[PDB]
Design a protein around this ligand. Structure first.
Ligand SMILES: *[C@@H]1O[C@H](CO)[C@@H](O[C@@H]2O[C@H](CO)[C@@H](O)[C@H](O)[C@H]2NC(C)=O)[C@H](O)[C@H]1NC(C)=O
Ligand SMILES: *[C@@H]1O[C@H](CO)[C@@H](O[C@@H]2O[C@H](CO)[C@@H](O)[C@H](O)[C@H]2NC(C)=O)[C@H](O)[C@H]1NC(C)=O
Ligand SMILES: *[C@@H]1O[C@H](CO)[C@@H](O)[C@H](O)[C@H]1NC(C)=O
Ligand SMILES: *[C@@H]1O[C@H](CO)[C@@H](O)[C@H](O)[C@H]1NC(C)=O
Ligand SMILES: *[C@@H]1O[C@H](CO)[C@@H](O)[C@H](O)[C@H]1NC(C)=O
Ligand SMILES: [Cl-]
Ligand SMILES: [Zn+2]
Lengths: 595, 197, 188
């Protein structure tokens, strides 16, 4: 008996036991998330602990196959998915130190509060306070206080934790035959071993940086229109040559500019399109919304939903008699069980979120005939993009007038399309330089190009160079501004949002070319397009068995990440941005400071 | 005419056998009315091989065997002449010249518990493939590698039988299915197994 | 007195043959039937009424050439005075049939590695077929005492099912069969 046959036998045992144990852990997590009681906390904390212990035990036995004498690619991919070590290659006093500083950062980010500087008893924490303050207020000093006190009370408490966390994760990465911790997060795209479709870990740097020079002609015009419209709101605070302050971007960290639509509206005479008043007149509920999403999904060739999705899922909140977490999450319990946990109100945003998560369910339903260690996306960017390309097509007025919510005798001019495209660009385009800047900062801190006494001075100049955001207050090297984000202080990868944004528009352009649509890309309805569904199912069926470089060419034709479908979507908005920027200054001067 | 074949004992049983220890009951010296088994729903797995279901009550055969076991819904297609898998290779093999019908139905309302029905097992690891109509009930430890372990499990030594869970929320294809396989033989014998006049 | 050759090439070396449930009827006449060319194929040449040696000796009438595709275990099935699945539901020869049943194994045209599902056979039929009767019906058979109104299920089966015809069986290999049925009881 060879080594690969023993590996296939061990994987056949693991795919029998791990599916049952993961179903137990997912059922305990579903019973916790559907009923927040005390009896479901201990069941989840026992089932997840048993599943983690079983995964650690099977990862311990998987290292007896030395990965070099197996010629099959599927067994090698499952064994690389199974032979992960993590913090097990370090000493115990460091492996528990990393956990007790990550939990310390999590408890500081969750529990840390900011008190008002007029009443020492009145204090405002994160979720009901400054998030709603910096998204509704329009004065300079209140947003300046809400930014600076949050960066002072919470930010500088995490810098001695981050200084140890970086070195501990670098030691953990170099113990697992890497060079830095940024290369470990870049190892998700490592397809080293496939003929004609290889992808190195270091190729992602000059594949992200190469697609960024085509965004900044659109991003510079977008930022030009944003601060040209924001100079009227804040007089004598924003210069027409310099950058934008961080506390005037609509949010806390400057990620999404979607809260700037009330001041940077193109045409304030007419309101935006919404069908909430059309849904509350025809007595629409959550079941009708999900059945209309199902009728949208079966018209391309995707199969019907299972009976368990209509029997065991929670599609409506039962009120204050059974406490449940009202956070929308698509569940993949395995063994043919697919559920959706969502407190669905009668809202157009809920109508788009239902399609966005039925896309995740139909993604989970496609590779059910795969092994258990391949039951995920090919990388961390396809899963949210499959959900996003359904919400792009569900928000079109063609689908809204085809399902019955819109009467056909309405006028659709360009003054609605520009207002829709700028609202789309404030969420999509405005977050990509911030994402690329943060990921390049983390990659240069992890690999050792930024020393410990040059963190904030390089951060606040790379913000000026990439994003165009200048600090309102001079910050020394005691603050830690990346530590004020949820994805950085809780050890989460952030390159997924840059890649998913390009993959979503690549999928949309591919399905629009397959759907034979002659108009613009933002009015492309792929509802009644059957020939595109068989091409999208050729990518949905794969999962993690075959490379993502081959999974792209099955649907979009290209082999790498392309940015031209992203620019083709906002091209009528790009011509309007060229038309509107006739007297403004396209660009920003990095030497200007508001203080 | 009041000598009926025991179809109610191999269909309406209290519990069915496993796929590695499948029961075999000989049916003889009675008339076989195949219009009695229409009471169950859902039912549409009636792939009769060799003979036609319309001419089923026209020919008289010798001693008829009946095999009953429990598998999942996605492995019902493996019970056919010329199929490859884990049930049709290590648990229950049908011949290529099989003359009979395969009858299965959904059993999610009877063979499911909250939470766990571990009484139904299936053989997963075996050295050689099974012969047609062979019943292996051994519990020998499978030798996955080139090293003896002397009856105990561990590295490269696994138990051949694996346990089903059978929870009632297991979608459509992972639901438990009670399968009854009828085999009609044509040996040189006094033929008595055929329907009413 | 040889005037023109009979069209034996279009009924033997055709592009495609029909199935056993939808067998065609090709009538040939007004020519000289030479059977010395017919030994070109490289297995079943049993002739009834007229011996195959003296086949080029008598002057006949309108010959009906029927082309169809069956398997290897059904060459013994199609015979005058037989019953079964093909001789009762698809194609039945008369009891006083005079002619030859020319069958030969091919294993190159009607056997695909993925499956050739273009040839159908009928297994479900109310009554037995008459001699020289063709039925290309497609209605769903009613097996029980319950009208389905067109739907399928137990006691309502589709009568037309397809063969597999893999080039790996022993028997089950496809046979391209052309049967001639002359009705009079010739070169120089
Ligand atoms: C086997 O079980 C079936 C259902 O599990 C039963 O069928 C019943 O048969 C009686 C006698 O004709 C009918 O009156 C009932 O209406 C049937 N029930 C159903 C649900 O179909 C019965 O227990 C067994 N079958 C027979 C023929 O005895
Ligand atoms: C009809 O039958 C076969 C087609 O399968 C062909 O026979 C060929 O005939 C030519 C003419 O003499 C020979 O050179 C070839 O060797 C024959 N091929 C085989 C495989 O036997 C042809 O199309 C027709 N036969 C005749 C005799 O015309
Ligand atoms: C590799 O594994 C897959 C899945 O088990 C199998 O289908 C394939 O035949 C294997 N390849 C080889 C060369 O054994
Ligand atoms: C599948 O979904 C469509 C869309 O609502 C519906 O009309 C149809 O009845 C569904 N089929 C099944 C079998 O549920
Ligand atoms: C497809 O076209 C039909 C007919 O115009 C329409 O009723 C339906 O809403 C469209 N969309 C889908 C998803 O079926
Ligand atoms: Cl910041
Ligand atoms: Zn989502």
């Amino acid at each position: 008996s060879t080594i690969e046959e023993q590996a296939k036998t061990f994987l056949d045992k693991f795919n029998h036991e791990a599916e049952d144990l993961f179903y137990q852990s997912s059922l305990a997590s579903w019973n916790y998330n559907t009923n927040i009681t005390e009896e479901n906390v201990q069941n989840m904390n026992n089932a997840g602990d048993k599943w983690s212990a079983f995964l650690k035990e099977q990862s311990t036995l998987a290292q007896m196959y030395p990965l070099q004498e197996i010629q099959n690619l599927t067994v090698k991919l499952q064994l690389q998915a199974l032979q992960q070590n993590g913090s097990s290659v370090l000493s115990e006093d460091k492996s528990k130190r990393l956990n007790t500083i990550l939990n310390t950062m999590s408890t500081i980010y969750s529990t840390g509060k900011v008190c008002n500087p007029d009443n020492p008893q009145e204090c405002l924490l994160l979720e009901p306070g400054l998030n709603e303050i910096m998204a509704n207020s329009l004065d300079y000093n209140e947003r300046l206080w809400a930014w600076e006190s949050w960066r002072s009370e919470v930010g500088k408490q995490l810098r001695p934790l981050y200084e140890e966390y970086v070195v501990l994760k670098n030691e953990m990465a170099r113990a697992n035959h890497y060079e830095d911790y940024g290369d470990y997060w870049r190892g998700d795209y490592e397809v080293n071993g496939v003929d004609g479709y290889d992808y190195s870990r270091g190729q992602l740097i000059e594949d992200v940086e190469h697609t960024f020079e085509e965004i900044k002609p659109l991003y510079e015009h977008l930022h030009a229109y944003v601060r040209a419209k924001l100079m009227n709101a804040y007089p004598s605070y924003i210069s027409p040559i310099g950058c934008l302050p961080a506390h005037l971007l609509g949010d806390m960290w400057g990620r999404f500019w979607t809260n700037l639509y009330s001041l940077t509206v193109p045409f304030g005479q007419k309101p935006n399109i919404d069908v909430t008043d059309a849904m509350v007149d025809q007595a629409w509920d959550a079941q009708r919304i999900f059945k209309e999403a199902e009728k949208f999904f079966v018209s391309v060739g995707l199969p019907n939903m299972t009976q368990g999705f209509w029997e065991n899922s929670m599609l409506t909140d039962p009120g204050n008699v059974q406490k449940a977490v009202c956070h929308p999450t698509a569940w993949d319990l395995g063994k043919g069980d697919f559920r959706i946990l969502m407190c669905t109100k009668v809202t157009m945003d809920d109508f788009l979120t239902a399609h966005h998560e039925m896309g995740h369910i139909q993604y989970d339903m496609a590779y059910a005939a795969q092994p258990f260690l391949l039951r995920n996306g090919a990388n961390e960017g396809f899963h949210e993009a499959v959900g996003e390309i359904m919400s792009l097509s569900a928000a079109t007025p063609k689908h809204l007038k085809s399902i019955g919510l819109l009467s056909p005798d309405f006028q659709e001019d360009n003054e609605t399309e520009i207002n829709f495209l700028l609202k789309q660009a404030l969420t999509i385009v405005g977050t990509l330089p911030f994402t690329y800047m943060l990921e390049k900062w983390r990659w240069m801190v992890f690999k050792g190009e930024i020393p410990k006494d040059q963190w904030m001075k390089k951060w606040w100049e790379m913000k000026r160079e990439i994003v165009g955001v200048v600090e309102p207050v001079p910050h020394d090297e005691t603050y830690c501004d990346p530590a004020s984000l949820f994805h950085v202080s809780n050890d989460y990868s952030f390159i997924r949002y840059y890649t998913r944004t390009l993959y979503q528009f690549q999928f949309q352009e591919a399905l629009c070319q397959a759907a034979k649509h002659e108009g613009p890309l933002h009015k492309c309805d792929i509802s009644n397009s059957t020939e595109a569904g068989q091409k999208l199912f050729n990518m949905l069926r794969l999962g993690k068995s075959e490379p993502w470089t081959l999974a792209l060419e099955n649907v979009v034709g290209a082999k790498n990440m392309n940015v031209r479908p992203l620019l083709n979507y906002f091209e009528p908005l790009f011509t309007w941005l060229k038309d509107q920027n006739k007297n403004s200054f396209v660009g920003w001067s990095t030497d200007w400071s508001p203080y | 005419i009041t000598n009926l074949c025991p179809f109610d004992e191999v269909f309406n049983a209290t519990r069915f056998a496993s796929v590695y220890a499948w029961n075999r009951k000989r049916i003889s010296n009675c008339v076989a009315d195949y219009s009695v088994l229409y009471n169950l729903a859902p039912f549409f797995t009636f792939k009769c091989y060799g003979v036609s279901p319309t001419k089923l009550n026209d020919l008289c055969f010798t001693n008829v065997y009946a095999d009953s076991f429990v598998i999942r819904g996605d492995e019902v297609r493996q019970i056919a002449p010329g199929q490859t898998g884990n049930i049709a290779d290590y648990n229950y093999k049908l011949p290529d010249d099989f003359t009979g019908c395969v009858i299965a139905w959904n059993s999610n309302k009877l063979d499911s518990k909250v939470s766990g029905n571990y009484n139904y097992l299936y053989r997963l690891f075996r050295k050689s493939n099974l012969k047609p109509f062979e019943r292996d009930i051994s519990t020998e430890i499978y030798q996955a590698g080139n090293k003896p372990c002397n009856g105990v499990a561990g590295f490269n030594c696994y138990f051949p039988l694996r346990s089903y869970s059978f929870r009632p929320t297991y979608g459509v294809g992972h639901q438990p299915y009670r399968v009854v396989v009828l085999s009609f033989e044509l040996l040189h014998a006094p033929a008595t197994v055929c329907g009413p006049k």
